[PDB]
Coordinates of C-alpha atoms and ligand atoms in Angstrom, one line a residue:
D1 CA -14.3 -17.5 -3.9
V2 CA -14.6 -14.3 -5.4
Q3 CA -18.5 -14.0 -4.8
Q4 CA -17.6 -14.8 -1.2
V5 CA -15.1 -12.2 -0.6
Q6 CA -17.2 -9.0 -1.8
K7 CA -19.9 -10.2 0.3
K8 CA -17.7 -10.6 3.3
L9 CA -16.1 -7.3 2.7
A10 CA -19.2 -5.6 2.8
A11 CA -20.3 -7.4 5.6
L12 CA -17.7 -6.0 7.6
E13 CA -17.7 -2.3 6.3
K14 CA -21.5 -2.4 7.5
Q15 CA -20.3 -3.7 10.8
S16 CA -18.1 -1.0 10.8
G17 CA -20.0 2.1 11.0
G18 CA -17.3 3.6 8.2
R19 CA -16.6 3.4 4.4
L20 CA -13.8 0.6 3.3
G21 CA -11.4 0.9 0.7
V22 CA -9.5 -2.0 -0.3
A23 CA -7.8 -3.4 -3.5
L24 CA -5.6 -6.3 -3.8
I25 CA -3.3 -7.2 -6.7
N26 CA -2.0 -10.2 -7.1
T27 CA 1.8 -10.6 -9.1
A28 CA 1.0 -14.1 -9.6
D29 CA -1.6 -13.6 -12.6
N30 CA -2.5 -9.4 -11.9
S31 CA -5.6 -10.5 -10.9
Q32 CA -7.8 -8.4 -8.7
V33 CA -9.7 -7.9 -5.4
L34 CA -11.6 -4.9 -5.2
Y35 CA -14.0 -2.9 -2.8
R36 CA -14.8 0.9 -3.7
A37 CA -11.0 0.9 -5.3
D38 CA -11.4 3.4 -7.5
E39 CA -13.2 5.8 -4.8
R40 CA -10.8 8.7 -2.9
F41 CA -10.0 8.2 0.9
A42 CA -7.1 10.3 2.5
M43 CA -3.9 8.8 2.7
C44 CA -2.9 10.1 5.7
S45 CA 0.8 9.1 6.3
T46 CA 0.6 6.3 3.5
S47 CA 1.8 9.3 1.6
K48 CA 5.3 8.4 3.5
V49 CA 5.6 6.1 1.0
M50 CA 5.6 8.0 -2.0
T51 CA 7.8 10.5 -0.5
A52 CA 10.8 8.2 0.5
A53 CA 10.7 7.3 -2.9
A54 CA 11.0 10.7 -4.5
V55 CA 14.0 10.8 -2.6
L56 CA 15.6 7.3 -3.5
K57 CA 14.8 7.9 -7.3
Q58 CA 16.8 11.0 -6.6
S59 CA 20.1 8.7 -5.3
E60 CA 19.9 7.6 -9.0
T61 CA 21.3 10.2 -10.4
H62 CA 22.7 12.4 -7.7
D63 CA 25.6 10.2 -6.2
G64 CA 25.6 9.9 -2.3
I65 CA 22.8 12.3 -1.7
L66 CA 21.1 9.7 0.5
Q67 CA 24.1 11.1 2.7
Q68 CA 23.1 14.6 2.6
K69 CA 22.8 16.2 5.6
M70 CA 19.8 18.3 7.0
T71 CA 19.7 20.3 10.2
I72 CA 17.3 19.1 12.6
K73 CA 16.3 22.5 14.9
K74 CA 13.5 22.4 18.1
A75 CA 11.2 24.7 15.2
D76 CA 11.5 21.9 12.8
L77 CA 9.5 19.3 15.5
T78 CA 6.1 18.3 15.2
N79 CA 3.3 16.6 17.0
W80 CA 5.6 13.5 16.5
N81 CA 9.1 12.9 16.3
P82 CA 9.7 10.1 17.8
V83 CA 13.5 9.7 15.8
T84 CA 13.7 13.4 15.3
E85 CA 13.5 14.6 19.0
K86 CA 16.6 12.7 19.7
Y87 CA 18.9 14.6 17.0
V88 CA 17.8 18.4 17.8
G89 CA 21.1 20.3 17.7
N90 CA 22.6 17.8 15.2
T91 CA 22.2 16.4 11.5
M92 CA 20.0 13.6 10.0
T93 CA 21.0 11.9 5.9
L94 CA 18.3 11.7 3.8
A95 CA 18.7 8.3 4.5
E96 CA 18.3 8.2 7.8
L97 CA 15.4 10.5 7.4
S98 CA 13.8 8.6 5.1
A99 CA 14.2 5.1 7.5
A100 CA 12.8 7.7 10.5
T101 CA 9.6 8.2 8.3
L102 CA 8.9 5.3 7.0
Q103 CA 9.3 2.9 10.2
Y104 CA 8.1 5.3 12.8
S105 CA 5.9 7.1 10.7
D106 CA 8.1 10.3 12.1
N107 CA 5.7 13.3 10.8
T108 CA 9.2 15.7 11.2
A109 CA 11.1 13.4 9.2
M110 CA 8.4 13.7 6.5
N111 CA 8.6 17.6 6.6
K112 CA 12.2 17.6 6.4
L113 CA 12.0 15.5 3.2
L114 CA 9.3 17.4 1.7
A115 CA 11.3 20.6 2.1
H116 CA 14.5 18.6 0.6
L117 CA 12.2 17.9 -2.5
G118 CA 10.8 21.2 -3.1
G119 CA 7.2 20.7 -1.7
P120 CA 4.2 17.9 -1.7
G121 CA 3.6 19.2 -5.4
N122 CA 6.9 17.2 -6.6
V123 CA 6.0 13.9 -4.5
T124 CA 2.7 14.5 -7.0
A125 CA 4.9 15.0 -9.8
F126 CA 7.0 11.8 -8.9
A127 CA 3.5 9.7 -8.8
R128 CA 2.7 11.0 -12.1
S129 CA 5.9 9.5 -13.4
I130 CA 5.4 6.3 -12.3
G131 CA 1.6 6.3 -13.9
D132 CA -0.6 7.5 -10.7
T133 CA -2.3 10.2 -12.0
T134 CA -4.9 9.7 -8.8
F135 CA -2.4 10.8 -6.1
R136 CA -2.3 14.0 -4.7
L137 CA -0.2 15.2 -1.7
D138 CA -1.2 18.9 -1.1
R139 CA 0.1 19.5 2.2
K140 CA 2.7 18.7 4.7
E141 CA 2.7 16.9 8.3
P142 CA 0.2 17.5 10.5
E143 CA -2.2 19.6 8.3
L144 CA -2.6 16.3 6.3
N145 CA -4.2 14.7 8.3
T146 CA -7.9 16.7 8.3
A147 CA -8.9 14.0 6.2
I148 CA -12.5 16.2 5.7
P149 CA -15.2 13.9 3.8
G150 CA -15.5 15.6 0.4
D151 CA -12.1 17.1 0.5
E152 CA -9.6 15.3 -2.2
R153 CA -6.5 17.4 -0.7
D154 CA -4.0 14.5 0.2
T155 CA -6.0 11.6 -1.4
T156 CA -5.4 9.0 -3.4
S157 CA -7.3 5.5 -4.8
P158 CA -7.0 1.9 -3.1
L159 CA -6.2 0.9 -6.9
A160 CA -3.9 3.9 -7.6
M161 CA -2.1 3.2 -4.7
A162 CA -1.9 -0.5 -4.6
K163 CA -0.4 -0.2 -8.4
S164 CA 2.3 2.4 -7.6
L165 CA 3.7 0.5 -4.2
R166 CA 3.6 -2.3 -6.8
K167 CA 5.6 -0.5 -8.9
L168 CA 7.7 0.9 -6.7
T169 CA 8.6 -2.3 -5.0
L170 CA 8.3 -4.8 -7.2
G171 CA 8.4 -3.2 -11.0
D172 CA 10.6 -0.8 -12.5
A173 CA 9.7 2.7 -10.6
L174 CA 13.3 2.5 -9.0
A175 CA 16.7 1.0 -10.1
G176 CA 17.9 -2.5 -7.8
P177 CA 19.4 -0.8 -5.4
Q178 CA 16.8 2.0 -4.8
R179 CA 13.9 -1.0 -4.3
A180 CA 15.8 -3.5 -2.2
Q181 CA 16.6 -0.3 0.5
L182 CA 12.4 0.8 -0.1
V183 CA 11.7 -2.9 0.1
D184 CA 13.7 -3.6 3.4
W185 CA 12.8 -0.2 4.7
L186 CA 8.6 -1.8 5.0
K187 CA 9.7 -4.7 6.2
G188 CA 11.3 -3.0 9.0
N189 CA 8.3 -0.9 9.9
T190 CA 7.3 -1.5 13.6
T191 CA 4.0 0.7 13.4
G192 CA 1.7 -2.2 11.2
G193 CA 1.3 -4.9 14.3
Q194 CA -2.2 -4.8 14.7
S195 CA -3.1 -3.8 11.2
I196 CA -2.8 -5.8 7.7
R197 CA 0.0 -8.1 9.5
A198 CA -2.8 -9.3 12.3
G199 CA -5.0 -10.4 9.5
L200 CA -2.7 -12.8 8.0
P201 CA -0.3 -15.9 8.4
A202 CA 2.4 -15.3 10.7
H203 CA 4.7 -16.3 8.7
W204 CA 4.2 -14.5 5.8
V205 CA 6.6 -12.1 5.3
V206 CA 5.9 -8.5 5.1
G207 CA 6.5 -4.7 3.8
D208 CA 4.0 -1.9 5.3
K209 CA 3.4 1.6 5.9
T210 CA 0.3 2.3 8.1
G211 CA -1.5 5.6 8.2
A212 CA -3.8 7.3 10.6
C213 CA -5.6 10.4 10.5
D214 CA -8.8 12.2 11.4
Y215 CA -12.4 10.8 11.1
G216 CA -11.2 8.1 12.4
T217 CA -9.0 7.1 9.6
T218 CA -7.2 3.6 9.4
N219 CA -5.1 2.7 6.5
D220 CA -2.9 0.2 5.8
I221 CA -0.5 -0.7 2.4
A222 CA 1.3 -3.3 2.3
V223 CA 3.5 -5.8 -0.2
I224 CA 2.7 -9.4 1.0
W225 CA 4.9 -12.7 0.0
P226 CA 3.2 -15.9 0.9
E227 CA 5.3 -17.9 1.7
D228 CA 7.5 -19.1 -1.8
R229 CA 4.1 -18.2 -3.5
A230 CA 4.3 -14.5 -5.6
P231 CA 4.0 -11.7 -3.9
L232 CA 0.5 -9.8 -3.3
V233 CA 0.2 -5.9 -2.8
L234 CA -2.7 -4.9 -0.8
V235 CA -4.2 -1.7 0.3
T236 CA -7.1 -1.4 3.3
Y237 CA -8.3 2.1 3.6
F238 CA -10.9 3.5 6.2
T239 CA -12.5 6.4 7.3
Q240 CA -15.5 7.1 9.7
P241 CA -18.3 9.4 9.9
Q242 CA -17.4 10.9 13.2
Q243 CA -14.5 13.5 12.9
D244 CA -13.3 12.2 16.3
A245 CA -13.7 8.5 15.8
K246 CA -11.1 6.2 17.3
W247 CA -9.2 4.4 14.8
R248 CA -10.1 0.8 13.8
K249 CA -6.8 -1.1 13.1
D250 CA -9.2 -4.1 13.8
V251 CA -10.8 -3.3 10.7
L252 CA -8.1 -3.2 8.1
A253 CA -6.7 -6.9 9.6
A254 CA -10.5 -8.4 8.9
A255 CA -10.5 -7.1 5.2
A256 CA -6.3 -8.0 4.8
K257 CA -8.0 -11.9 5.9
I258 CA -10.5 -11.6 4.1
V259 CA -8.5 -11.3 0.7
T260 CA -6.0 -12.8 1.3
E261 CA -8.2 -16.2 1.9
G262 CA -6.6 -19.2 0.1
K263 CA -3.5 -16.8 -1.2
Ligands
CAC1 C1 2.3 8.7 13.7 AS1 1.0 8.8 12.3 C2 -0.9 8.7 13.0 O1 0.8 10.3 11.3 O2 1.0 7.2 11.1

């Protein structure tokens, strides 16, 4: 029931030692389950969804732009280049870059997209264009990972990101072809196994983008299809008091189990 969900989330937060942010949107009736849903949390890598979506939006006008190439140079590399490191001295299309940053959370791929787009400010501009006035991307990787308490840079709220993810994957923020590609990329993510997914029934279909940064900030945003029922959009953000706190993916899994029970 709705009161036991609240009691349980509060208990989970107390047990975690950190600050928990949750926003679930049930598209069946647009009902919502909220917990610190209007509070700001550092987005970490979950901001990569808005970024890849900004590129997809461009492809709606500029035909074939997803195939535009960008050179990958040693100097472009960062602290995380699972895919990009294989293309040094070669090129990658915006599509390949989008796929790498979304499914492997490649930081270099992210920066290449930011460069193409003209900077973090233009990603924020795209968020605004889909009705998100909370989201704000201020820096590139890996600086956007500082997650300093009280610092609003590179942050957003659970509800704002939930609403945006919904518009992007199920709503009309993107055109049909672009929308389908984003959904497919999210479903093909390889980094969310121990997060939101871990707290859901194994047969449910899911698309998600994880995030993890300083202050033990552990995040994950997803679109969930429970069997043949209407899709669910869930955002689970979590951050801790210690700058060097270890990540708690298990906390996101627990939050997911709690808010999707009986859905
Ligand atoms: C590769 As990462 C920890 O910024 O999602």
